[PDB]
Amino acid sequence: MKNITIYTKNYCPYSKKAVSLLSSKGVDFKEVDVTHDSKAFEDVMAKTGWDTVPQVFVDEEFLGGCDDIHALDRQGILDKKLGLKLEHHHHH
Template sequence: MTDATHERIEKTVKDNDVVLFMKGTPLFPQCGFSSRAIAILDRLGVAYDSVDVLQDMEVRQGIKTYSDWPTIPQLYVKGEFIGGSDIMMEMFEAGELETLMDEKQVAKAEAE
């Protein structure tokens, strides 16, 4: 991973309270795991940003190095790596993800 890619990823992670590195977009997820991750975030009602790794191969590979995690999607909350869709699902079902969002004082999504 180039320094520039690392810096771009780090800036994205630090500048957004909640960011999901995913395949596709929230409206058009390109894999089931990304779709599930978006569904969880939408159910929680939190404001989040997303990065479509399919649009940038350097970010697609770089995020795996950055987090030392081999799969996508990847969720970050307030700069902290949380995990992929399986971990998100486990935490969501246990109520832990909602608690984490509250503890980190993550903003709620604005109603459209």
């Protein structure tokens, strides 16, 4: 399983919706609540240059926010990013 992390705040509808989407995918993931934690939020802001929640990561790859991960899903490429099963056809 990949290391999936989402940074959230408890008043934010968009972080709640992103968590919901991730739950809907059947993956395990770590939620880091930064509602009350300036240091943790600043550390992540330094990493991405983004100053909002949610921020979603898969093994150090930053996928963005609520809008971004929903766009990835419409594009059909969120599953792959999250570590869901890949199928390959082998031909001789």
